[PDB]
Amino acid sequence: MFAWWGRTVYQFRYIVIGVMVALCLGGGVYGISLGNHVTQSGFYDEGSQSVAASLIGDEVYGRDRTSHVVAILTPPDDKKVTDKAWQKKVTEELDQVVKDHEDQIVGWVGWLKAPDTTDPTVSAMKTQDLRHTFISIPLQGDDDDEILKNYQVVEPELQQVNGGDIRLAGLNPLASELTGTIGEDQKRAEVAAIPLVAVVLFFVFGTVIAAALPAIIGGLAIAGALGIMRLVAEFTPVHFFAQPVVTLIGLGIAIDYGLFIVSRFREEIAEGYDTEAAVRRTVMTSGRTVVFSAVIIVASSVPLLLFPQGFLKSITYAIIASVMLAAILSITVLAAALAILGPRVDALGVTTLLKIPFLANWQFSRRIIDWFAEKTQKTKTREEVERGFWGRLVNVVMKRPIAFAAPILVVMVLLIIPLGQLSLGGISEKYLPPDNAVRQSQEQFDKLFPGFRTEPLTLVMKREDGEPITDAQIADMRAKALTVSGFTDPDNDPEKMWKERPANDSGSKDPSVRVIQNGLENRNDAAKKIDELRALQPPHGIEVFVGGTPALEQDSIHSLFDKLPLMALILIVTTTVLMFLAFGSVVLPIKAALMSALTLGSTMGILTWMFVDGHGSGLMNYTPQPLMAPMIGLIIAVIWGLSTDYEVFLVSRMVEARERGMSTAEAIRIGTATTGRLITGAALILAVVAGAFVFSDLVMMKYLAFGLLIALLLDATIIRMFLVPAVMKLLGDDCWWAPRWMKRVQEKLGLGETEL
Ligand SMILES: CCCCCCCCCC(=O)OC[C@H]1O[C@H](O[C@H]2O[C@H](CO)[C@@H](O)[C@H](O)[C@H]2O)[C@H](O)[C@@H](O)[C@@H]1O
Ligand SMILES: CCCCCCCCCC(=O)OC[C@H]1O[C@H](O[C@H]2O[C@H](CO)[C@@H](O)[C@H](O)[C@H]2O)[C@H](O)[C@@H](O)[C@@H]1O
């Protein structure tokens, strides 16, 4: 089957290049418009109680808008706010921008709009020393995304109010900055990573145009994937976080997927096979591996569709779309271009890259001239001594494999320890580095006049009869709520608790629905209190609902842990069963799934140490805080899909030598030493693109990027060099065992192509 495609792609090589390069280029312009039609919501359980309790709450009583924007105004010259000239100056400016932007701003409400009012909450908007005061600026827009796009329209004119001296904080200022980091490290990754992945590409090839093709494939893959996600946006919403993931993961491993097609072809040319035959021996040894690599990542990501969060559901689409397209790009495009370039792929060399003024550029001259001087000596000689070093290192391991596996085994287990302190939370201003201008304003806002920031649990009552709800009917539900201790009462009066939620001027006050809300005492108790509140029995007609941001996160935190074992099971069994089909062996997938579970578990214990306890918060500039619930579900699906893939690389060369007649140590040594340079490049290529996104201002992007760079490092070193050879030799001849029915399944399914 795979041999059939290798021979048809050479007979049909000109038409497959034209068809595939056109589609990846067509998605380029289409992917450019994607950056505009993208939704930010999706962190809550799309279909759940706490979620649908906010739908009814925002519908009947009205979507709250007093937290869209808050603006702290301070008069200059140490003038106090009672200065009438200052009040008239700012109020005219505030009325003007509101007058200028009708389709964006709904208005501005605050103490300045009525300087002499008796409503003490509005009166408490000023400060004590009369040095500052703030306002609320509600914004238009029906959905969450429309409101932000409106704020981004009015942000410039709103900051020049009071002559610059105005502090903008609130929900929409934060959302503008958080979604703004997506494009920042996107540029950082294109200024500092695509050159470095290029210098790693010819680090492993000794040829320029050979190195260009994985970058060409890598660049082609994201251009097609970004085109797919903009098409997907027409049906169901896509998240802002999808665009970095395609670059962080899809781009890097698309180069890796192509980094294997060029090298195996050069190895086949190095043996002495002609152009027609070289594409055949590469597809069944690299293309069959690249196909199984991506399908494994697919099988390592579809169990996230079990999770309810639309945030994760959008990501798995991009991960599926990027790696499967990159794999199809690897076989269909990269193999056909090597028949067109033919044996003259290794022609240009470094000296030809020196043609255009890459030397006039500071960085590339140093990189070019080094490869030229090393071309006559260092680049070709060091490869054999490193190939020999890779072979010598493994026999130092296999000489006393227990001496290397046992210290490695105990260390990785000792790193899973901090995972027991995994605190989970939600998005807040803390997701930004504490030196941030917006975060400090929101923090100074909260420190100036406490009591406006509230995360209250809501009780949503709804009858289906349609009759209005009596005050005695409300009194019964309000009576039951007083049994669950732990809700606030600064009034110290039990009647003053669980007030009626404010009603907006935009909600059909269907009297079948009435909602009351009160603020918790300890957010940690939410998981327990919402359980207690949901445990209360409903009224003669109505059905209760527990909502608010605590119930929203605590349900999303909960919704992860339920589907997680079913995810872990589906993930483990589908990755393991796909590795057996690839290797033909059975115990290697069972062994790899251990090492994969050994790698994934150790990495999240480091992340928990440095991100929840803050061992590194002082250096990388962030603040230790409870992690995001869908994030740990994501990073589980990623590390597994990566650890599995790099083990697919190291072992697929051993099944080649084993099924070629060689001994087990021959199979291991052939596997590790012939790849010891390839995987290290693929590791560095990702460690480059991952290193870019690690400097992100968004702490959760730091989390995903560190978890990549950490586990990717362990897969390239401790597992590839040490643990795999140590554990494999203890198996000996057992490494390749397989029941015949299990084999014949692989063999007659068109995939039992064991060796060449
Ligand atoms: C089907 C899902 C519907 C869930 C209900 C959402 C409708 C509006 C709810 C509420 O009025 O405000 C929503 C919360 O917004 C912030 O939380 C985050 O919002 C998005 C993700 O949804 C995120 O991108 C943003 O950066 C966060 O600010 C507030 O923090 C919450 O307090 C609000 O409840
Ligand atoms: C790879 C497969 C591994 C599967 C392992 C599944 C283990 C499930 C563990 C359990 O479900 O979680 C226990 C509780 O953890 C949290 O409790 C704290 O979390 C935060 C912050 O500390 C907070 O929301 C909560 O109040 C804390 O007690 C969850 O929040 C709880 O819901 C879990 O029950």
Coordinates of C-alpha atoms in Angstrom, one line a residue, residues 375-708:
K375 CA 32.6 22.4 5.2
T376 CA 36.1 21.3 4.2
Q377 CA 36.7 19.8 7.6
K378 CA 34.4 20.0 10.6
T379 CA 30.9 19.3 9.3
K380 CA 31.7 16.0 7.5
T381 CA 34.2 14.6 10.0
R382 CA 32.3 15.4 13.2
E383 CA 29.2 13.5 11.9
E384 CA 31.0 10.2 11.9
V385 CA 32.7 10.8 15.3
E386 CA 29.3 11.8 16.6
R387 CA 27.7 8.8 15.0
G388 CA 30.5 6.8 16.7
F389 CA 30.0 8.8 19.9
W390 CA 26.3 7.9 19.7
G391 CA 27.2 4.2 19.3
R392 CA 29.8 4.3 22.1
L393 CA 27.5 6.1 24.5
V394 CA 24.8 3.3 24.2
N395 CA 27.3 0.5 24.9
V396 CA 28.4 2.5 28.0
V397 CA 24.7 2.3 28.9
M398 CA 24.2 -1.4 28.0
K399 CA 27.4 -2.3 29.8
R400 CA 25.6 -1.6 33.1
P401 CA 22.0 -0.7 32.2
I402 CA 20.8 -1.0 35.7
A403 CA 23.3 1.6 36.8
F404 CA 21.7 4.1 34.5
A405 CA 18.0 3.2 34.6
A406 CA 17.6 3.0 38.4
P407 CA 18.8 6.5 39.1
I408 CA 16.7 7.7 36.2
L409 CA 13.7 5.8 37.5
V410 CA 13.9 7.2 41.0
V411 CA 14.5 10.8 39.9
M412 CA 11.5 11.0 37.6
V413 CA 9.2 9.5 40.3
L414 CA 10.5 12.1 42.8
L415 CA 9.5 14.9 40.4
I416 CA 5.8 13.8 40.3
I417 CA 5.6 14.7 44.0
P418 CA 4.6 18.4 43.8
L419 CA 1.7 17.4 41.5
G420 CA -0.2 16.7 44.7
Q421 CA -0.5 20.4 45.3
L422 CA -2.3 21.2 42.1
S423 CA -4.5 24.1 42.9
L424 CA -6.8 25.2 40.0
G425 CA -8.3 28.6 39.4
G426 CA -9.7 30.9 36.7
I427 CA -8.6 33.9 34.7
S428 CA -7.8 37.1 36.5
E429 CA -5.5 40.1 36.3
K430 CA -2.8 37.8 37.7
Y431 CA -2.5 36.2 34.3
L432 CA -0.3 39.2 33.4
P433 CA 3.3 40.0 34.7
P434 CA 3.0 42.1 37.8
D435 CA 4.9 45.0 36.2
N436 CA 2.1 45.4 33.7
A437 CA 0.5 48.9 33.4
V438 CA -3.0 47.5 33.2
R439 CA -2.6 45.0 36.0
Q440 CA -1.3 47.6 38.4
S441 CA -4.2 50.0 37.6
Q442 CA -6.7 47.2 38.2
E443 CA -4.8 46.4 41.4
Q444 CA -4.8 50.1 42.5
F445 CA -8.5 50.2 41.6
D446 CA -9.2 47.3 44.0
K447 CA -6.9 48.8 46.7
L448 CA -8.5 52.3 46.5
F449 CA -12.2 51.4 47.1
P450 CA -12.9 47.8 47.9
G451 CA -16.3 46.3 47.7
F452 CA -17.0 46.7 44.0
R453 CA -15.2 43.6 42.8
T454 CA -17.6 40.7 43.5
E455 CA -17.7 37.1 42.3
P456 CA -21.1 36.2 43.7
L457 CA -22.9 32.9 43.5
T458 CA -26.3 33.3 42.0
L459 CA -29.6 31.4 42.7
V460 CA -31.8 31.3 39.6
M461 CA -35.4 30.4 40.2
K462 CA -37.6 29.6 37.2
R463 CA -41.2 28.2 37.0
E464 CA -42.5 26.6 33.8
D465 CA -46.2 27.4 34.6
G466 CA -45.6 31.0 33.5
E467 CA -47.3 32.5 36.6
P468 CA -45.5 35.3 38.4
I469 CA -43.5 34.2 41.4
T470 CA -44.9 35.5 44.7
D471 CA -42.8 37.2 47.3
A472 CA -43.6 34.3 49.7
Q473 CA -42.5 31.9 47.0
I474 CA -39.2 33.9 46.9
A475 CA -39.2 34.0 50.7
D476 CA -39.1 30.2 50.8
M477 CA -36.1 29.9 48.5
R478 CA -34.4 32.8 50.3
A479 CA -35.2 31.0 53.6
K480 CA -33.4 27.8 52.6
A481 CA -30.3 29.7 51.5
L482 CA -29.6 30.8 55.1
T483 CA -28.9 27.3 56.2
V484 CA -25.6 27.1 54.2
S485 CA -23.1 29.1 56.2
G486 CA -20.3 31.1 54.6
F487 CA -22.0 34.1 52.8
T488 CA -21.2 37.7 53.5
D489 CA -23.2 40.2 55.5
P490 CA -21.4 43.5 56.2
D491 CA -24.8 44.8 57.3
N492 CA -24.9 42.1 60.0
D493 CA -28.7 41.8 59.4
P494 CA -30.0 38.5 58.1
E495 CA -32.8 40.4 56.1
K496 CA -30.2 42.4 54.2
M497 CA -28.7 39.2 52.7
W498 CA -29.3 37.6 49.2
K499 CA -30.5 40.8 47.7
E500 CA -32.5 40.9 44.4
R501 CA -30.1 41.1 41.5
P502 CA -30.2 44.4 39.7
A503 CA -32.3 44.4 36.6
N504 CA -30.9 45.9 33.4
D505 CA -32.9 48.0 30.9
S506 CA -32.5 45.2 28.3
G507 CA -34.1 42.0 29.7
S508 CA -37.7 40.7 29.4
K509 CA -38.5 40.6 33.2
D510 CA -40.4 37.3 32.8
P511 CA -41.9 37.0 36.3
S512 CA -41.4 33.2 36.0
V513 CA -37.8 33.9 36.8
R514 CA -36.3 35.8 39.8
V515 CA -32.6 35.7 40.8
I516 CA -30.8 36.6 44.1
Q517 CA -27.1 36.5 44.7
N518 CA -24.6 36.8 47.6
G519 CA -20.8 36.7 47.8
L520 CA -18.9 33.8 49.3
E521 CA -16.4 33.9 52.1
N522 CA -13.6 31.5 51.1
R523 CA -13.3 30.8 47.3
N524 CA -11.8 27.4 48.3
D525 CA -15.2 26.4 49.8
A526 CA -17.0 27.0 46.5
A527 CA -16.6 23.4 45.4
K528 CA -18.1 22.4 48.7
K529 CA -20.6 25.2 49.0
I530 CA -22.0 25.0 45.5
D531 CA -22.4 21.3 46.2
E532 CA -24.3 22.2 49.4
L533 CA -26.3 24.8 47.5
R534 CA -27.1 22.4 44.6
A535 CA -28.0 19.8 47.3
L536 CA -30.9 22.0 48.5
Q537 CA -34.3 20.8 47.3
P538 CA -36.5 22.9 44.9
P539 CA -39.8 24.8 45.5
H540 CA -43.4 23.6 44.6
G541 CA -42.9 24.8 41.1
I542 CA -39.5 26.3 40.2
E543 CA -36.1 24.7 39.5
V544 CA -33.1 26.2 41.2
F545 CA -29.8 27.0 39.5
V546 CA -26.4 27.8 41.1
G547 CA -24.5 30.2 38.9
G548 CA -21.9 33.0 39.1
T549 CA -18.2 32.8 38.4
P550 CA -17.3 30.4 41.3
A551 CA -19.9 27.9 40.1
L552 CA -18.7 28.6 36.5
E553 CA -15.1 27.7 37.3
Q554 CA -15.8 25.0 39.9
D555 CA -18.0 23.2 37.3
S556 CA -15.4 23.7 34.6
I557 CA -12.8 22.4 37.1
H558 CA -15.2 19.5 37.8
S559 CA -16.0 18.8 34.2
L560 CA -12.3 18.2 33.6
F561 CA -11.9 15.5 36.3
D562 CA -14.9 13.4 35.2
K563 CA -13.9 12.9 31.5
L564 CA -10.2 12.8 32.4
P565 CA -10.0 9.1 33.2
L566 CA -12.0 8.3 30.1
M567 CA -9.7 10.6 28.3
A568 CA -6.6 9.0 29.9
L569 CA -7.9 5.6 29.0
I570 CA -8.9 6.4 25.4
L571 CA -5.6 8.3 25.1
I572 CA -3.4 5.5 26.5
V573 CA -5.1 2.6 24.7
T574 CA -5.3 4.4 21.3
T575 CA -1.7 5.5 21.4
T576 CA -0.4 2.1 22.6
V577 CA -2.4 0.2 20.0
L578 CA -1.1 2.5 17.2
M579 CA 2.5 2.0 18.3
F580 CA 2.1 -1.8 18.1
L581 CA 0.8 -1.6 14.6
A582 CA 3.8 0.7 13.7
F583 CA 6.6 -1.4 15.3
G584 CA 5.0 -4.8 14.9
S585 CA 6.1 -5.3 18.5
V586 CA 3.8 -5.4 21.5
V587 CA 6.1 -4.8 24.6
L588 CA 7.7 -1.7 23.2
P589 CA 4.4 0.2 23.1
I590 CA 3.6 -1.1 26.5
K591 CA 7.0 0.0 27.6
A592 CA 6.8 3.3 25.7
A593 CA 3.4 4.1 27.3
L594 CA 5.2 3.7 30.6
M595 CA 8.0 6.0 29.6
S596 CA 5.3 8.4 28.1
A597 CA 3.5 8.3 31.4
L598 CA 6.8 8.6 33.1
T599 CA 7.6 11.7 31.1
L600 CA 4.2 13.4 31.2
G601 CA 3.9 12.9 35.0
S602 CA 7.4 14.3 35.7
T603 CA 6.9 17.4 33.6
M604 CA 3.7 18.5 35.2
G605 CA 5.4 18.1 38.6
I606 CA 8.0 20.6 37.6
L607 CA 5.4 23.0 36.2
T608 CA 3.4 22.7 39.4
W609 CA 6.6 23.5 41.3
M610 CA 7.6 26.6 39.3
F611 CA 4.2 27.9 38.4
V612 CA 2.0 27.2 41.5
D613 CA 4.8 27.6 44.1
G614 CA 6.7 30.2 42.1
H615 CA 10.1 28.6 42.1
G616 CA 11.1 30.7 39.1
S617 CA 8.4 33.4 39.4
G618 CA 11.1 35.9 40.3
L619 CA 13.2 35.2 37.1
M620 CA 10.6 34.6 34.4
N621 CA 8.5 37.5 35.9
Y622 CA 5.1 36.2 36.8
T623 CA 3.2 35.3 40.0
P624 CA 2.4 31.8 41.3
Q625 CA -1.3 31.1 41.0
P626 CA -3.7 28.2 40.6
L627 CA -3.5 26.9 37.1
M628 CA -6.2 26.7 34.5
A629 CA -8.4 23.6 34.5
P630 CA -8.7 22.9 30.7
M631 CA -4.9 23.7 30.5
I632 CA -3.8 20.6 32.4
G633 CA -6.1 18.6 30.2
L634 CA -4.5 20.1 27.2
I635 CA -0.9 19.6 28.2
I636 CA -1.6 16.0 29.1
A637 CA -2.8 15.4 25.5
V638 CA 0.3 17.3 24.1
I639 CA 3.2 15.8 26.1
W640 CA 1.8 12.3 25.4
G641 CA 1.5 13.1 21.7
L642 CA 5.1 14.3 21.6
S643 CA 6.8 11.7 23.8
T644 CA 5.0 9.0 21.8
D645 CA 6.2 10.6 18.6
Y646 CA 9.9 10.8 19.5
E647 CA 9.8 7.3 20.8
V648 CA 8.3 6.3 17.4
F649 CA 11.4 7.8 15.8
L650 CA 14.0 6.1 18.0
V651 CA 12.4 2.7 17.8
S652 CA 11.3 2.5 14.2
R653 CA 14.9 2.3 13.1
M654 CA 15.4 -0.6 15.6
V655 CA 12.6 -2.7 14.2
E656 CA 14.2 -2.1 10.8
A657 CA 17.6 -3.6 11.9
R658 CA 15.9 -6.3 13.9
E659 CA 13.7 -7.5 11.1
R660 CA 16.8 -7.3 8.9
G661 CA 18.4 -10.2 10.7
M662 CA 20.6 -8.2 13.0
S663 CA 20.8 -8.9 16.8
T664 CA 18.9 -6.9 19.4
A665 CA 21.9 -4.8 20.4
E666 CA 22.5 -4.3 16.7
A667 CA 18.9 -3.1 16.3
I668 CA 19.2 -0.7 19.3
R669 CA 22.6 0.6 18.2
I670 CA 21.5 1.0 14.6
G671 CA 18.3 2.8 15.8
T672 CA 19.9 5.2 18.3
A673 CA 23.1 6.2 16.5
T674 CA 21.7 6.7 12.9
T675 CA 19.1 9.0 14.4
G676 CA 21.1 10.6 17.2
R677 CA 21.5 13.7 15.1
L678 CA 18.1 13.8 13.5
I679 CA 16.0 13.8 16.6
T680 CA 18.3 16.3 18.4
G681 CA 17.6 18.7 15.5
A682 CA 13.9 18.0 15.7
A683 CA 14.2 18.6 19.5
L684 CA 16.1 21.8 19.0
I685 CA 13.7 22.9 16.3
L686 CA 10.8 22.6 18.7
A687 CA 13.0 23.8 21.6
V688 CA 13.5 27.0 19.5
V689 CA 9.8 27.6 18.6
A690 CA 8.9 26.6 22.2
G691 CA 11.6 28.9 23.6
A692 CA 9.9 31.8 21.8
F693 CA 6.4 31.3 23.3
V694 CA 8.0 30.7 26.7
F695 CA 8.6 34.5 27.1
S696 CA 4.9 35.2 26.7
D697 CA 3.2 37.7 29.0
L698 CA 0.3 35.3 29.3
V699 CA 1.3 33.0 32.2
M700 CA -0.6 30.1 30.7
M701 CA 1.3 30.3 27.5
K702 CA 4.4 30.2 29.7
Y703 CA 2.9 27.0 31.2
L704 CA 2.2 25.2 27.9
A705 CA 5.6 26.4 26.4
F706 CA 7.6 25.3 29.5
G707 CA 5.8 21.9 29.5
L708 CA 6.8 21.5 25.9

